[PDB]
Amino acid sequence: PKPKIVLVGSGMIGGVMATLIVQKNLGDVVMFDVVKNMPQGKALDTSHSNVMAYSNCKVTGSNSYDDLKGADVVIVTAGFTKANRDDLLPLNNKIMIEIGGHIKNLCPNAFIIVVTNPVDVMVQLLFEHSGVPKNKIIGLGGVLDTSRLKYYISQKLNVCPRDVNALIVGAHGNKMVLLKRYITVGGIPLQEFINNKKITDEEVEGIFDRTVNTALEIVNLLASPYVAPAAAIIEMAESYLKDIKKVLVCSTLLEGQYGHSNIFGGTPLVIGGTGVEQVIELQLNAEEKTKFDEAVAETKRMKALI
Amino acid sequence: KPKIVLVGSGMIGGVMATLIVQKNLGDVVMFDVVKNMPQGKALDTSHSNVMAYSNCKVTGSNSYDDLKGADVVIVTAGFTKAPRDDLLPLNNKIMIEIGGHIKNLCPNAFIIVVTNPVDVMVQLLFEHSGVPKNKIIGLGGVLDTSRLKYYISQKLNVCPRDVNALIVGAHGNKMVLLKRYITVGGIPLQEFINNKKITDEEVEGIFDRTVNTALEIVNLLASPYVAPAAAIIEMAESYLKDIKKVLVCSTLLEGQYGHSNIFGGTPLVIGGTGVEQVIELQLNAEEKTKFDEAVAETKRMKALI
Amino acid sequence: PKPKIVLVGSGMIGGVMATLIVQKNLGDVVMFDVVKNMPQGKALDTSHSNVMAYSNCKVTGSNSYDDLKGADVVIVTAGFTKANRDDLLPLNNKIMIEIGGHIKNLCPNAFIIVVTNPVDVMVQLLFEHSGVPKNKIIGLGGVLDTSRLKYYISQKLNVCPRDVNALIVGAHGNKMVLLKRYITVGGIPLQEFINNKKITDEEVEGIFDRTVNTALEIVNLLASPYVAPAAAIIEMAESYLKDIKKVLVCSTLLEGQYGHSNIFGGTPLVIGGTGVEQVIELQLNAEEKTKFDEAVAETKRMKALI
Amino acid sequence: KPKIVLVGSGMIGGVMATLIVQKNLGDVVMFDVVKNMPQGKALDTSHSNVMAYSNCKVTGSNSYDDLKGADVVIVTAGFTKAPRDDLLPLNNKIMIEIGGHIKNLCPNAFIIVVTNPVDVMVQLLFEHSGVPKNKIIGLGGVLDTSRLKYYISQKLNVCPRDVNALIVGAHGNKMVLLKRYITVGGIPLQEFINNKKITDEEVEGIFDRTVNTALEIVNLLASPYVAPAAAIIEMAESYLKDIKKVLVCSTLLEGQYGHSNIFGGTPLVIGGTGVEQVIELQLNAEEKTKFDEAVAETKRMKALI
DNA sequence: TCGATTGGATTGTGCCGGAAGTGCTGGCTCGA
DNA sequence: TCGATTGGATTGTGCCGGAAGTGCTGGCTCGA
Ligand SMILES: [Mg+2]
Ligand SMILES: [Mg+2]
């Protein structure tokens, strides 16, 4: 009766996700990791927070892929991140193959969210080896990236962060396409605020660069991004589990949109109870489309290196 | 802990008190000139603290004395008419009375005016209460746009809150529905029109429905009060928690859109100090014409108090 | 995918329930009433509040019992309340028969919460005519009554209302059994607070009487109780829908507990995803058991008058 | 809007900052003596305002100067040891330093101390900060009882929060687990024992597990910080929103249980003025003996700073 | 013989204990 | 001919409009 959420990967992001799931009473949680005992420990700690949250989510740890059985949602964060980053692609491909095989056998009706980087490659690899329908698997990207852009704008303009809307498309990572044309504040075009000298074009460009550079900025400060990534993922999962039909930018299978096929890329989607209910194709101008093309080209380049 | 005084404990007051307890926003005084009724509603509501895990006192009052020390005052009191100018003098008197009490008892309160016609009444209460211009606003845009957003969202099959829209000028039949400023998930509505997911004609139809929603509800033998209460609490909460939401509300115009000495609906930023920013939209000529018509109607009615 | 909640009765309590369901994003709502148009109007108003709540619940009105089809939860508030109150029993019995027939045909797997008074009679009548399992139908009583007791105690002692716990059993209504022995404050027996002179036995008796008399107190003040009843009902429904397994005092079929069978009465229950998961029989002393007996006797007396 | 300063930005600090943003409770300063790290964590956390619909500033600091104007200060800084007395002098020094700064910069702040051994450290910080006795408490009972409540709830198949329990005296191996005060849905646990739904032996086993939970987690290669952070935020929130929850925390004893000049765990009421009530449990002789043992251990360690 | 999962406390990092103290390494088992 | 669903705005209350103004009733349709 309660949803089963399996976290494939119980690292930094996995931990925060389990915490938020208990806070929101969203479902039972399996914290899976190939590393022995650690996820069981994290699960034990997290389970006690049910009391403070007035929730009732079972939180367990697992080192067995057999616990994917009957999952309603599967969130994949596991994979190599440390020692050229391209060198990690064949390793993580192998991991995606393994996971895919289990999903196919044990929870083929699950909704799958992929986080492992580079996400636009990894999500397609898992799609190919899991056999799940295209409307049932997406990758994390736009919700996180746009949360950075929205937040920075909101702080310059002194408004509620959620009241800034913005779209970032194409791919997660350094080739992300920031669409200046599509930024609004309380529903009002950003350009009105630029005209009123509340923010300059220069400052906006600085905020674009900071958005692109945020992960590196956090790592250079001897931290790692996992709170905002976890919150973004849980926003996606919750939109599925509660059939909210939020418009969220995620990585999805392109079937001709933006002139590309047989590749995943970031685009606004509607996430509801049946999974991806709508794929929205933005009416990009030529320059924006060129940037999208470049993002997709980089995804393809890396896909060839598995 | 904040003190919220509801001047008027009718059906919208009831829902407001319910939501304040749900959100644990502050202690509540339910005031009404009707004897005993607000005490009864307050008693009922107070028990819901248990279910909500909250701790808000909820009391009823027939005395304006209980305005003392209010942090927020929400005025819904006043004569109503189902969807005329005859309400203007009567309700003027009420604004005078309430105003005096605010002036004497809670001059630092943040005031939200709901009494219709709201764009007139909020200015009257502003004048008679003596509060600063950044500390008093009128309900309009949050409610009207909640209707517009909802109807569009159901045509496009998306989350209602993911539609954004601005309705300005005045709260009433002359409300200015700004088609150019509608977005869905941050995307201009024009893109959905181009893709034939919705038409210009359907958008105009939804504009008409939005304008006439209170009438539509009354024709169905109901009274609009749930959404109005929720809109008011969204405003009050943005103040109490310093959220700095952009919310369209009626505020004193000081030259914006070419108008002064009058209140009108415009996007505002609501935070801990009250109205922190009044945002003037860069309207084109046609839009400005519509805004002018809305303000002209407010002025016309103001002449009849 | 989203739960379907059908409110059979769209009066004062129904209205607040629909409002709270949207606030909590708990499910789609059908506001049913035999009265034409009114529920459609209330539904239209309530639906707009989805925007303020960041929810996505469809709220519709209905004058057709056919809309019970596929209900996951059915909440019955409809029935005569106005012109001896016993005179209303045969009328409301007829209503329970009608409703029951539709549940049997259209949503036999629904979880049913009965509110129509006198609830301990009405809930059994609906049980008998709906054919639903005994673990799938309960009546409102204890959550509401104890919310009054908890609140009044909490105000005298100046603590959080939820930190007072108390049990009231037997029946909803004037024969409710208030169990002084079972009152705690922050987990601490009330008697410790009486010993410390924070509250007297006299004051406690006054609070007991006020608890019994609360509905009358509100009506005498020219109001009607519907906010707290609605919140209590939604707490019950949510415990079912989200499998929380809260301990909640409700009216349920007695099968020998407290020495009674073939009758419904108020007792602590556990409400989870399968409905009533546990019926907890309190270890009452002789005096308490006599009071329970008297409550059940009144329920039987009224049941004979349909 | 409240200012919350986290003195210590380790793993428990991270979860605290995350929860404060989720609950929109106030602006957050993540302080640490470790350079750059809290700035990075704060930057990460700040973005989650968007997902949470909140507006809490989250900044990082390596300067005690940013204590200025804090409404709440949560101290987790200090040397740790996995589940000895050698921590006592070292952490004493830290309490002195932090204390001085509080005294100078936020003397009206509400202080929550977590640094172990907490019942000693909270008293040291009390002494060196000069804050009133009702404005400083130590973490213990909310966390320990969250474990006890959870384990019992899973044996009886009920909602974890519906188990109530008191653990008093001290936060550590001498914690006093009061079997007589356990309830389930308000019902004495003894009734469930009588019905054989759970046994006396299983309750003693769960007591043992509760005492040793941090060790159990560490043996599983993890570190307890999620539940501790959640407990701390429940305390802080009861202060910030004036909820008046009954929460077991370490507080200055002034004759309660026969002890003075020492802090110990007891049920408290936490509201807008701080500790509004210190509730002395009416313990029997055996329970009192256990309480005495807990306090005697705190005293023993206090002698070694 | 020789390395140790896609994770991590304070430190590093196959695990486990002792030492030092804003802080890692020596001595061990398991199984390829 | 004669009453009007288990609900309700401001008032009452089958519905619908006008009047008066912290506030109801006159004139109508539908269908038993
Ligand atoms: Mg490793
Ligand atoms: Mg009727």
Author numbering:
A (entry chain B), C (entry chain B): 3 to 85, 94 to 316
B (entry chain A), D (entry chain A): 4 to 86, 95 to 316
Question: What does the publication say?
Answer:
The dissociation constants of the DNA aptamer pL1 for the recognition of P. vivax lactate dehydrogenase (PvLDH) and P. falciparum LDH (PfLDH) were found to be 16.8 nM and 38.7 nM, respectively. In this study, we determined high-resolution structures of the pL1:PvLDH complex and apo-PvLDH by X-ray crystallography in order to understand novel ssDNA structural elements, ssDNA folding and interface features for specific pLDH recognition. pL1 folds into a hairpin-bulge contact by adopting three novel structural elements defined as a T-loop-like motif, base–phosphate (BPh) zipper and DNA G·G metal ion zipper. Therefore, pL1 recognises PvLDH predominantly via shape complementarity between inflexible regions and many bridging water molecules (bridging waters).
The pL1:PvLDH complex was crystallised under two different conditions. The crystals belonged to P21212 and P41212 at 1.9 Å and 1.71 Å resolution, respectively. One aptamer was bound to dimeric PvLDH in an asymmetric unit of P41212. The dimeric PvLDH places one pL1 in a single cluster of DNA-contacting residues that forms a concave region determined by the Cx algorithm. Therefore, a total of five intermolecular H-bonds and one salt bridge are observed at the interface between pL1 and dimeric PvLDH.
